[PDB]
């Protein structure tokens, strides 16, 4: 208990010191993501067929 | 700087080129994923070409 | 002479920033706990 | 009966004094976070303050 | 008796104590990665960062 | 100063540039929150600009 929650202070300070991008970010991304794949394998399909 | 730029794309450009035959016989999974996987060195590709202009 | 005061009285306001910086992971540490 | 019941107050009471230890923290963090930035403004309305700044 | 329970005892107890030196390695593991992890992010924030970057 | 307006209006311009995707296929939800964080790089893009002429 006691070592553990020395655990959590170390953990606790990384994210103050490194923000985490906020859920927006991960929505356009994944969003953007999927055009990606999709638009680079919409050629795939069309320049095979 | 610009050799690790060209060595980044011959990489996509091995999975792309193994992307061609993975989509081929009708197995879309297989493409699927592995163009997935060429998206995060296409990324760092962009990147260091923009390094490199600036730093002419 | 006010200048040196204006650079000194910053440094003293990084001490506590860092102070407060302190602060709220031991607030984040609790609440995970 | 003795030994049963004075068990039940000792059960009782170790509940409470950790309970008691975990809002300990939790206001003293509270306490340090406005000791913290009270005084930063108060050097703001000291330094940049338009009244009478001694930045300006 | 005596000798009877007593061993049940040193039995049971025996098995504890293996059991927490099993953990006793996994916490000290687990503490090590996240202090050398606390330190190097600290070095880049005192490096990178844009606010008062000592590199840049 | 110079520099750290031009690197805001790239932040905002990103945005923009990006956010010409997410108004395109007609996902405006996405655009109209995406324009609201660019007001804030907007505001202070304009602060500086007003310095710049100033320290001239």
């Given at each position: 208990?006691?070592?553990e929650?020395?655990?959590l202070?170390?953990e606790?300070?990384?994210?103050?010191?490194?923000?985490?991008?906020?859920?927006?970010?991960?929505?356009?991304?994944?969003?953007?993501?999927?055009?990606?794949?999709?638009a680079?394998?919409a050629?795939?399909?069309?320049?095979?067929? | 700087?610009?050799r690790?730029?060209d060595?980044?794309?011959?990489?996509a450009?091995?999975?792309?080129?193994?992307?061609?035959?993975?989509?081929?016989?009708?197995?879309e999974?297989?493409?699927?994923?592995?163009?997935?996987?060429?998206?995060?060195?296409?990324?760092?590709?962009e990147a260091?070409?923009?390094?490199?202009?600036?730093?002419? | 002479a006010?200048?040196?005061?204006?650079?000194?009285?910053?440094g003293?306001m990084?001490?506590?920033?860092?102070?407060?910086?302190?602060?709220?992971?031991?607030?984040?540490?609790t609440?995970?706990? | 009966?003795?030994?049963?019941?004075?068990?039940?107050?000792?059960q009782?009471?170790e509940r409470?004094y950790?309970?008691?230890?975990?809002?300990?923290?939790?206001?003293?963090?509270?306490?340090?976070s406005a000791?913290?930035?009270?005084?930063?403004?108060?050097?703001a309305?000291?330094?940049?303050?338009?009244?009478?700044?001694?930045?300006?």
């Amino acid at each position: 208990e006691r070592i553990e929650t020395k655990i959590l202070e170390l953990e606790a300070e990384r994210e103050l010191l490194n923000p985490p991008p906020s859920p927006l970010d991960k929505k356009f991304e994944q969003w953007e993501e999927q055009q990606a794949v999709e638009a680079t394998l919409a050629a795939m399909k069309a320049r095979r067929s | 700087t610009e050799r690790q730029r060209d060595a980044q794309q011959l990489i996509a450009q091995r999975w792309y080129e193994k992307a061609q035959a993975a989509l081929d016989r009708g197995n879309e999974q297989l493409a699927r994923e592995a163009l997935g996987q060429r998206q995060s060195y296409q990324s760092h590709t962009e990147a260091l070409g923009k390094s490199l202009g600036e730093q002419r | 002479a006010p200048e040196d005061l204006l650079e000194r009285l910053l440094g003293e306001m990084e001490l506590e920033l860092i102070e407060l910086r302190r602060a709220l992971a031991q607030t984040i540490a609790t609440f995970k706990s | 009966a003795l030994v049963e019941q004075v068990r039940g107050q000792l059960q009782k009471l170790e509940r409470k004094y950790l309970e008691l230890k975990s809002q300990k923290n939790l206001y003293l963090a509270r306490l340090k976070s406005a000791i913290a930035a009270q005084k930063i403004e108060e050097i703001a309305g000291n330094l940049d303050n338009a009244s009478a700044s001694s930045l300006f």
